[PDB]
Amino acid sequence: FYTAPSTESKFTEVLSKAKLQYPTSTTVAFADDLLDGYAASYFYLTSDLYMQFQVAGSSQRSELREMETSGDEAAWDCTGSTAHVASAQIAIPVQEDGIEEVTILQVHDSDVTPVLRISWVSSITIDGVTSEDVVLATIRNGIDDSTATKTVLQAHTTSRTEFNINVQNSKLSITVDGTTELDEADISQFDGSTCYFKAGAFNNNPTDTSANARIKMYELEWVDHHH
Ligand SMILES: O=C(O)[C@H]1O[C@@H](O[C@H]2[C@H](O)[C@H](O)[C@H](O[C@H]3[C@H](O)[C@H](O)[C@H](O[C@H]4[C@H](O)[C@H](O)[C@H](O[C@H]5[C@H](O)[C@H](O)[C@H](O)O[C@@H]5C(=O)O)O[C@@H]4C(=O)O)O[C@@H]3C(=O)O)O[C@@H]2C(=O)O)[C@@H](O)[C@@H](O)[C@@H]1O
Numbered sequence: 001f002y003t004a005p006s007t008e009s010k011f012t013e014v015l016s017k018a019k020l021q022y023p024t025s026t027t028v029a030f031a032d033d034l035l036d037g038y039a040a041s042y043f044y045l046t047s048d049l050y051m052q053f054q055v056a057g058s059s060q061r062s063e064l065r066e067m068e069t070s071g072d073e074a075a076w077d078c079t080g081s082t083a084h085v086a087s088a089q090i091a092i093p094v095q096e097d098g099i100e101e102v103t104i105l106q107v108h109d110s111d112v113t114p115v116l117r118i119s120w121v122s123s124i125t126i127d128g129v130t131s132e133d134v135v136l137a138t139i140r141n142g143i144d145d146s147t148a149t150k151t152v153l154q155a156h157t158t159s160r161t162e163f164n165i166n167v168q169n170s171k172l173s174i175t176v177d178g179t180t181e182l183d184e185a186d187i188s189q190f191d192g193s194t195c196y197f198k199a200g201a202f203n204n205n206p207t208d209t210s211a212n213a214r215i216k217m218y219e220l221e222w223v224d225h226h227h
Contacts, residue, residue, distance in 0.1 A: 076194060085222070
């Protein structure tokens with residue numbers, strides 16, 4: 001009894017350029033399935049026209065993964081000359097009790113390393129400064145280094161917020177409601193990797209493994225701009 005995100009033309013292009021993974025990394029719906037009206041409790045259109053992702057459990061996800069229209073997985077040069085841009089209007093609801101971090105947008109390499117995660121966090125401490133109820137950027141320092149550089153981007157609001165990720169040459173920038181909050185962070189540690197975008201809800205380290213993480217997107221797109 002769920003309405004499909006494909007019923008809204010604002011999502012046609014991104015769905016044509018995506019596959020949906022749930023609840024782990026296995027694809028449940030390819031682009032053709034998504035365009036044919038795929039809908040489930042974990043991926044549906046709300047009455048006010050948001051594409052909503054919902055998932056329970058540690059490190060589980062309901063996430064779109066960037067694809068080419070040819071059916072090839074997106075695998076662009078992480079630090080190449082072509083700009084790659086992901087834009088999303090996201091409303092992050094107050095999360096259920098026991099949900100502690102939800103990743104909403106990623107730049108991921110073609111193996112096992114997230115270049116960037118944008119996530120909501122109940123709390124975070126960075127260089128001795130603790131922030132609560134914020135949206136955070138996490139950039140991994142290397143494939144062989146589990147540590148990351150973390151940057152608070154925004155105090156959490158339930159209001160629809162524009163997020164824009166721009167990746168070009170060895171630099172990555174993030175704008176939030178038009179304001180640059182991460183200005184040309186270095187990602188040269190991914191030279192010689194390939195990359196793709198992801199968007200949705202990816203539930204990180206919950207304290208209640210039965211609680212549902214929930215993220216809503218009013219607009220979503222990923223594009224290339226050729227130098
Ligand atoms: O807690 C700490 O100590 C540190 O945590 C750091 O952040 C963590 C996060 O908390 C998450 O755990 C995050 O999880 C990553 C995970 O490390 C892997 O990168 C994994 O990669 C999957 C891909 O997203 C993708 O879904 C892929 O799909 C493939 C798959 O092969 C599929 O079967 C099919 O064949 O093809 C598809 C495809 O489309 O390419 O599968 C990958 C997989 O192996 O599961 O996904 C998550 C993720 O980010 O999505 O990891 C970070 C981390 O950096 O380790 C950080 O906060 C740090 O500061 C802390 O100290």
